[PDB]
Write a protein that binds this ligand. Structure first.
Ligand SMILES: Nc1ncnc2c1ncn2[C@@H]1O[C@H](CSCC[C@H](N)C(=O)O)[C@@H](O)[C@H]1O
Ligand SMILES: Nc1ncnc2c1ncn2[C@@H]1O[C@H](CSCC[C@H](N)C(=O)O)[C@@H](O)[C@H]1O
Ligand SMILES: Nc1ncnc2c1ncn2[C@@H]1O[C@H](CSCC[C@H](N)C(=O)O)[C@@H](O)[C@H]1O
Ligand SMILES: Nc1ncnc2c1ncn2[C@@H]1O[C@H](CSCC[C@H](N)C(=O)O)[C@@H](O)[C@H]1O
Ligand SMILES: Cc1c(O)cc(O)nc1CC(=O)O
Ligand SMILES: Cc1c(O)cc(O)nc1CC(=O)O
Ligand SMILES: O=C(O)C/C=N/C(=O)/C=C/O
Ligand SMILES: [Li+]
Ligand SMILES: [Li+]
Lengths: 262, 261, 264, 261
């Protein structure tokens, strides 16, 4: 707990990266839960296992008789933590749609965001409820150009767009990873201004690469166990360290906006 | 070079953490070089091997017949990269001073900063030149309270204080590590505002722990070989990434202020 | 460009004036509406909300709209119109002309009033070809989101659009012209202050809104806008970077009308 | 508070006025000098630089100094003295009295003129017990460092001190009262804007310095300082947080005299 000498303290935050991830994904799951108003479903299909998809699918098990996660990456089966959730890779779903009858969801949720599922694939369903996650955060022309959320809202008797922002703060996307990074970065900025702090370390890395380039979910989850922030200071900063992090986590606001249509 | 899909790019900065470290330590070494005005010395003693001390000691070999690094941590002998530099731990030095004649430096440089060498030990020398690195950066009451740089300027015919700041930007200390962290953090914030960037990763960790808690200099040097920043974006940002990092490195200004009398 | 307290320090006032930033923002909003309207011609356009972009937006409609009427709840805002080609009606005069007469039947309705503005009830009294409602929400804020009712105002019109205005890469709480101008200037000041040799950086800001709505003096308000956005104290020349930073922040404003789909 | 454009939006003017922030800052500088002087009494104090902290600092010296004189190169700055117990001299009148008369022989000299101010040559004409020079440098800026000559002004006096003023954890380019007031208000505005329900946040700023030095109108300047520092447009009440944020940023100002050995 000392640094280079006993004159300096090293403090690692109690809040871990996985704790921030958990808070964000829980907010998204609760936003969906609120939108669905306790409606029960026979078959839910959720596109996009990483990063919030896993927990969102878990949260649907109560009111959905069957919950299926679909991901173009077969190795993301490893990111599911409950066995009640069925996993299908995109080729398996598309095959089952073409030469089968078992796929006819009354709830469809697209969490894939930028460069994700095609409106054509969504158009193959006729659910009671369709939710599309809007990957756009605050304004960025380049991201707006590549977004096609509105084109994906092409089926369903009830339609919603899942939005996630940080109150009073700028983030480029609504993605769980983006929000976690931005929470940590903003927290570091304020922590560094605490009296006696020498420097403030965000324990960040390109976690996305661990999942999608190394294709190592186990390692990714281990990486999330790290303290979010490590601080070097002369005086104790334990309590303010957690207070600043928790405050920035609390700014995340997730909600489904109903999209009107007949 | 793609991310989750081919619609998103992943870009790793060409500038590595060690490159930023190198730039900062070079500025400190050059600040000392300028202050010394080409004066030649028989024996230089540098306190504090980590983080700039190693290169600073190297830079003194030209004009100093003997250059000795002293560190309270014996394992920091591993952070010296030239064989021309002699290493002594604090115990070995303090003993050679009491019952020896081999230690009589005409150049003394204290790079230890916060919680470092005592003024009592500095007072045991009588060099031509004394340089003390001021660990204080911009204003912080807690850091000012523990600093005793001025009390260490107690010997030497010529006295100087090595200061390092970032032009127009706030940093809590002049330490190489602090400056590298702050360069990367400020660069990340500006990079994130580039059009089409989704998020911006500073490839940071508690490197100091690797050196002083794990006592693994080799691992530490390996950790520095990492790209400073990794970006997720829709469009190419390769050149802007380097421009922003380079600009923030260039804000570092290191200089020795002469302490009169 | 002059000296400060002594000739060792320079005082630089920006060439860009507050009114120039206002102009650029209101022009972007007007052009967003223009693009949405796709050259359609209209017999009668009614624009709710004269301040701050309404005056110019209404003027920009004159080309394709035979008659353009600005409606504002504040009668003194008649003073904020550019010329006589736009008709001004206070809210009371409109609501009376709606009840007694046939002269009010717009085929284009634009609501620019934003927070606490026109009621969905009043909008529902029209049956235009096109309805545009300005969304006052900027980036995320719970308190502003809670008081906004933009979606409830989109209750008439064969074609419906929502006018949105944000700053690329930067946070603003609303899309209001005033908010955006303030934030442009504030973000510019923070970057200008970091220029080498700057001592301090003054945003030439005040509560301009009060001049319009509390003092009720539009002429004074327009005079207040005819002032350099920023004044800088520095050792060295900063005139060029000063304008470049302001111009860059102005260019981040992005205004567009998002079509609100309604098949029925 | 009052309503804004409609009764759905509120307008809040801060209770803290610009003049209150000025007062707090100049008081901190005066107390820094007070602490440095350790209750020593003086026969004649000369303070160079009436604007902006000089007026109050001179007032604060009346207690322990039999005579207090403010010297300014601008004769109209006699108007910024609020106490008649303080004597005013323009620079010409002083230099003439130094060359011919004998009435000028201060035992306390304080130079508050900072950038482009009094010359070391003029300071060298005195032989006080105590010399204090205000260091105008704030945090690091190369252009400002290059024009500063504070150290060259510390050329007389049995006891020498440098008056420094910084903001804890925050960046300011100078120690000037005006710079600090501006930066306090600007940093407060940034944080206030992030309060829930705030639409926009107005710093009630203008180029006050011009009112004093270009319009040469101290009366108007003092009236200009009698405005709320910040005006906020918001949906919900923010009055409590508005004052707390301003007060917090004021409290970051730290002024102290460093003894020059
Ligand atoms: N066409 C497609 N069909 C199914 N899954 C897809 C897809 N394209 C991408 N995906 C998956 O969807 C995810 C995209 S990343 C989604 C991140 C999410 N918005 C969050 O906040 O966490 C990845 O798991 C990716 O493998
Ligand atoms: N009393 C002492 N004698 C010698 N070395 C000491 C010491 N106290 C601390 N040290 C060493 O001095 C260094 C302190 S860290 C110095 C950081 C430096 N300012 C920079 O910018 O890189 C460490 O290597 C530590 O082990
Ligand atoms: N019910 C109503 N009818 C007509 N005008 C109204 C109104 N309520 C408010 N207004 C007017 O609408 C304007 C609100 S301020 C609108 C700001 C605008 N969004 C911009 O970006 O500039 C004011 O001129 C106000 O007087
Ligand atoms: N050579 C000189 N002799 C006397 N006064 C001078 C001078 N040069 C400048 N001045 C005066 O000194 C002041 C410089 S401004 C000083 C600001 C001060 N540091 C603060 O914190 O408020 C002005 O009043 C100016 O008129
Ligand atoms: C939001 C998002 C996305 O929809 C697609 C992608 O490749 N990356 C991100 C960023 C993130 O995951 O945070
Ligand atoms: C500090 C200072 C100064 O010494 C000289 C000058 O012209 N301007 C300033 C800035 C200020 O007054 O804040
Ligand atoms: O005008 C602004 O920028 C802020 C908003 N003020 C309001 O009262 C209503 C806006 O729609
Ligand atoms: Li020598
Ligand atoms: Li952008």
């Amino acid at each position: 707990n000392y640094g280079i000498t006993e004159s300096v303290k090293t403090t690692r935050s109690k809040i871990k990266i996985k704790d921030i991830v958990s808070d964000v994904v829980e907010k998204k799951a609760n936003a969906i839960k609120y939108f669905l108003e306790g409606e029960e479903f026979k078959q839910a299909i959720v596109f996009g296992a990483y990063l919030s998809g896993s927990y969102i699918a878990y949260s649907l098990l109560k009111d959905c008789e069957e919950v299926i996660i679909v991901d173009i990456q077969p190795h993301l089966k490893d990111i599911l933590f409950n066995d009640g959730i069925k996993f299908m890779d995109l080729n398996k779903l598309q095959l089952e749609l073409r030469n089968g009858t078992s796929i006819n969801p009354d709830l469809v949720i697209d969490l894939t965001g930028i460069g994700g599922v095609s409106p054509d694939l969504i158009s193959k369903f006729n659910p009671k409820v369709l939710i599309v996650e809007d990957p756009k955060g605050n304004h960025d022309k380049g991201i707006s150009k590549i977004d096609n959320t509105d084109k994906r809202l092409c089926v369903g008797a009830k339609k919603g767009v899942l939005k996630t922002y940080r109150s009073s703060k700028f983030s480029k996307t609504s993605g769980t990873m983006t929000l976690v990074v931005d929470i940590i970065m903003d927290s570091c900025r304020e922590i560094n201004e605490l009296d006696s702090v020498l420097y403030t370390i965000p324990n960040l890395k390109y976690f996305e690469g661990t999942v999608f380039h190394e294709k190592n979910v186990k390692k990714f989850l281990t990486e999330l166990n790290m303290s979010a922030i490590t601080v070097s200071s002369i005086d104790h900063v334990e309590y303010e360290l957690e207070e600043i992090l928790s405050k920035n986590i609390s700014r995340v606001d997730s909600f489904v906006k109903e999209f009107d249509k007949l």
